[PDB]
Amino acid sequence: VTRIERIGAHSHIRGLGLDDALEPRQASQGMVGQLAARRAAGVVLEMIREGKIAGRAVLIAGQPGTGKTAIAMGMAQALGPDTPFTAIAGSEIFSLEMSKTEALTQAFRRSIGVRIKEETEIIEGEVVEIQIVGKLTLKTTEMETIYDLGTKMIESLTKDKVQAGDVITIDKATGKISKLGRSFTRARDYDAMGSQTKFVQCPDGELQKRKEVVHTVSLHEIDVINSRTQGFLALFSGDTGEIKSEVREQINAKVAEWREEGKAEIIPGVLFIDEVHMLDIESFSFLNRALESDMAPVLIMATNRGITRIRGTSYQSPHGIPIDLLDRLLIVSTTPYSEKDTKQILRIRCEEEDVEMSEDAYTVLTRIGLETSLRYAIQLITAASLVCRKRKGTEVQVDDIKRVYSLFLDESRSTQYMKEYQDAFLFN
Amino acid sequence: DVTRIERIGAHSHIRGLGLDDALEPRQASQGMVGQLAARRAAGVVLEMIREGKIAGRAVLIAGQPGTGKTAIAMGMAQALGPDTPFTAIAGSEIFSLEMSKTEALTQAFRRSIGVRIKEETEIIEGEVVEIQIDRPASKVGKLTLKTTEMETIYDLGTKMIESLTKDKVQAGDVITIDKATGKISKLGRSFTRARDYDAMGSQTKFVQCPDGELQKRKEVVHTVSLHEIDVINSRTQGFLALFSGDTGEIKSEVREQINAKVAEWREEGKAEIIPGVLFIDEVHMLDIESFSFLNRALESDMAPVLIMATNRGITRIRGTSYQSPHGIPIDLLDRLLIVSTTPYSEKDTKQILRIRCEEEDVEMSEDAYTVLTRIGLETSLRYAIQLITAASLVCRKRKGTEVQVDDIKRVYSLFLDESRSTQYMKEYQDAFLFN
Amino acid sequence: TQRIASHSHVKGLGLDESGLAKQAASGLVGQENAREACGVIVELIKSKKMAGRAVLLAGPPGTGKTALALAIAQELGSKVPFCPMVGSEVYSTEIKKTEVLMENFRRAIGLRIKETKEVYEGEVTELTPCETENPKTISHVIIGLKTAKGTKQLKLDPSIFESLQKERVEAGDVIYIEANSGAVKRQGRCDTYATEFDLEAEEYVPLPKGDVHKKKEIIQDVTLHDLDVANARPQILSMMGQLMKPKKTEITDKLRGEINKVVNKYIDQGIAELVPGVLFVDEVHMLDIECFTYLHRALESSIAPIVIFASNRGNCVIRGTEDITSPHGIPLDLLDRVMIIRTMLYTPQEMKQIIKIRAQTEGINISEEALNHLGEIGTKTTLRYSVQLLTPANLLAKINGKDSIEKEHVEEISELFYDAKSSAKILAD
Amino acid sequence: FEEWFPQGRPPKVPVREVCPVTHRPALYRDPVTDIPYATARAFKIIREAYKKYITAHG
Amino acid sequence: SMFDLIGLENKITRHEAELLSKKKIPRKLMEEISTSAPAAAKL
């Protein structure tokens, strides 16, 4: 069945393909070539796992199509889902709801997980009888007990309309009641059931259990929850506005106290900002200070620009980043692919897309990709597969590649054809 | 001694304009040094403000940086007193996300016009000598007040009984009752509560017994600006917006209604207009739209006296491509008088440094005064002023009593002025960003 | 705290008693003149006499400007409020830039409130009224309070009978009574009467410890901005306000003046003590002309904190102007109001000292030859780059089963990762 | 007066019940025998003893 | 409503959801319940 997630541009990548010594293996876990860059990404991944040093910034820089985002996806896959990995595009911070600095702060705080443990003492059981002073009788498969009821407790039992046969949980620390459902029985079967009705088995073991529960949240979620009375709604709608510095400072201090008490754990993650050259000078200046915080995640960036104009200024800088921020980060450089690496990337893409191709087809597709671009060849893989299926074939041949090459143009051929008829296109 | 909210600021030495009865400035009075022509002009403008008969008179204080424009404005503010409103804003304050620039300029103008309301109130003031309240379980009660001159027993209505119970009025309390609305205020106690009562852990001072008649016809003076009236009348919960500043563009119809009723209140005896001063420092940050609004705004009868300051020469008007004197359009310059400030001399600089040392409580030698005056003339007045404080700290670090030349040379070497810092920046220009 | 940041090794200005900077102390190396001037600035802050004094840290990148500011902050302690800001933060979407600046100014003025409360707390053991003939009439209400220390009887004013029945105080209930108002507050049944069979939570409380009568001192630290925010929007109007987004508001000068008056009244009454602090504005060159102009007036206020600016832009065009260049991206008018402290480039020896201190703080064992190689790399490239190589080289060494960084690990890490200049060279080609 | 000033005798300290099976501080009471207990095994033993008693008595 | 998430924020808890998932009645128990279809004394 077609699940929500389908074959995308990075579906074949399932990690960095490194060994225990971080030596890059050729054609491992979907990664081909980029040996030096993959080794550097492994070193950065070890830094992220260690977590000791906050605010380390890494810029993955290279030519278009050299696997920068592929390396980022490999890092995200190799890193466990427990550790946060916030992947955004540079253009996601330009919002009408909040300033750019607020958006970068929220991206920073979303990339730091905090794991909070909590112990509670609850009484869970099936209600046998309730008498309106008051008395309540509960039972499990192993025990039966009767309690005396206070004024607030009898009020809570009445308001929730707890009836005999229900399964309820009452927290001794707070005295609140929650109805988990009603136990099914010979007499409680009905022709229609209410929306809230849930059938549940009688609880096992002892009534008064001691719980240990661990909640995994992030600093941004804590900020939003503490932003206003119904702040957790903004965890859905995103209408968080600009969270005040008071709330953030009080949360940083409370989390520090929690970690000192052993209640919470901090899991520093990664903030990947692809296409980082969309950030403006204000964003870069904010990042220069934001990375100096001890609650800063490890920052990874990707760009393909050369000596280009910094957005928001008239200055030109390498990678479109001012040298203040470039001095604060390490640069990993990608390398253009060889013929062998191109062919192996095409083979892995065919294996993911479930396409069978003849060897001559592999040679011609590799030549096309070397001459035009790797992405164009990847697209022509599925194009030729479709054209072959329309032909009632079972293996993609060179003729199908020539067919799709004639049907779908690349940038160069399309540009040449546009220039040939430039009198018809607008605003040349 | 104790560290107050207000500390020694850049103009804490300014106490006024330092003028005589004939508005002839003194050489050194009320913290002012020099600027004889500028201070005489400021005195004439202050008299024009205090007379209040002429509306929308604009004066621009123009001069070189550090020549005392803000000092003269603060002197005018000090000599004006708190009775007359004096709203000082930076020109960059009008650029708001909550309201248009013209709305901001209107609120600034309307904040600089006080409305002094007067009303007569019936006030009962006396010592509670006996209070009896009897309630079922309507309320009945009896209250006796004394004021040295008389002792009257009152039979209390239900609403007065409720107010007295809410205030928790007890015998021995000096209270005030507003007969117009029944509000009860306690001025203080006249003697202790019974010593036999536990807790009640206080021995507060006891105010003296009231004198004269119990009930007096008291006239009370309440002053509100036009902006407060506007914000209060703008919506049902307007008063909350006076503090939070969440005031949208107040409807012009409400402002016209207020201007009309205020005119009636001044034709009647209910209120008196106190027109004040709006001081827009660094007015060159205003754009062409704000100056164009100021042109029409000064023609209103409710406009205050507008004082402006800027050091810009012939410069480009913000939002345009045209250059005009002071960064102000010629159309607004026509509507104002320009007051020019002159650079100081050695004597004036030395006197200013002396006054700043006196306000900072720094004892400094005469040779130190000479070297600091030379530094201030060479570099800047503010730089020498800041070296006063730095040299005081360096002298106290060495356990010295009087700031000597060695301390001034030390702090001069430690802290650079714009010129030496610029020279060193040029000497290392390749290390700085973008050349 | 536990995680290691770029400035986690900065523990303060390494100054002696005479105000001179040691060559290397408290994690700082060199910058003797700049540390001495920062020392005079720290004394200025601690003097509390002056308001609105500005100092500009100016110098090349990686010359310790932010390290010196955080060293000043460490010297001042945690009592003095030190508010870090970056110039990019003024461009908010909820409020004007001048409001952001004024809010950060008021964040750097601290106020310490001292509250002394007298309370009589304990488990109620009797509530007997004292009948009398009026000169049934009661002249006192005797309440017996029990604590783990003992029992006390209080001859309370008879009027407290209303509050006792309002609070439904009964024998065996834990209460506390404040000395001033004399109103009783009930806090639950004493836990000595709680059984394991009855279900209630809030209605039970342990017997108070200590003497029945207590004098409690509560000290709270606030900023003037905290009071501003509290009085600007107090917490059905509350329902609508909490449902809608509570945006920042352009707090009026009226509210700030009223709050200044209230704080002055508290300081006169002795309830409160002011702790004026420091606002640090890094990357101040991101401010626009309107912000710098506003700062002209803000620094002349008698209420302003001491502000520390930092810039490295050199002769650069002022933001929000066209072609108006200034020595640091700051208009010359503001530069006349600030003292400038220059920061200077480091020598190779100072770079080696900083690298060693960083390695110590990160917990990294570095060999002498490795330290020399990384220093020589840092004399090329940048200091920041050489520092950043420390932990990846330590990890590379740990992979190879070495407890200390060897030179080969530094060489390999340098071969893997490139600096800004090497990348510029690759881009040019 | 007596409504506003009830002379309430101080509450008696509750009996700190103990489980007759394991002699642990009692946490529960069985609704059917009204005997306190502290663990599930205690509950089973109490109910077996109760059915023994009720068979012996009638 | 199977996709309604925000409605669960005021109706259930993660631990309660785990309990519900663990203790849901299986088919055989319902079949048995359809097929089959204490006097206290103060001692």
Ligand SMILES: Nc1ncnc2c1ncn2[C@@H]1O[C@H](COP(=O)(O)OP(=O)(O)O)[C@@H](O)[C@H]1O
């Ligand atoms: N190292 C690699 N191994 C395998 N496939 C790669 C690699 N790098 C790029 N690709 C392929 O090319 C595309 C990814 O290129 P991408 O990383 O987006 O380039 P850029 O650096 O411009 O972002 C994917 O379709 C993927 O199949």
Ligand SMILES: Nc1ncnc2c1ncn2[C@@H]1O[C@H](COP(=O)(O)OP(=O)(O)O)[C@@H](O)[C@H]1O
């Ligand atoms: N005539 C004067 N008398 C006393 N102090 C002065 C005088 N002129 C300037 N000063 C002080 O010198 C400094 C100059 O700043 P300021 O007066 O704001 O100049 P401007 O507003 O022209 O830039 C301030 O501290 C000011 O109080």
Ligand SMILES: Nc1ncnc2c1ncn2[C@@H]1O[C@H](COP(=O)(O)OP(=O)(O)O)[C@@H](O)[C@H]1O
């Ligand atoms: N003199 C010094 N002694 C010790 N550490 C320093 C010194 N100067 C800079 N550092 C450290 O090296 C890095 C330089 O960054 P920073 O001080 O922020 O430079 P910038 O002046 O560019 O802001 C920081 O981690 C800082 O703690």
Ligand SMILES: [Mg+2]
């Ligand atoms: Mg990409």
Ligand SMILES: [Mg+2]
């Ligand atoms: Mg001025």
Ligand SMILES: [Mg+2]
């Ligand atoms: Mg820095």
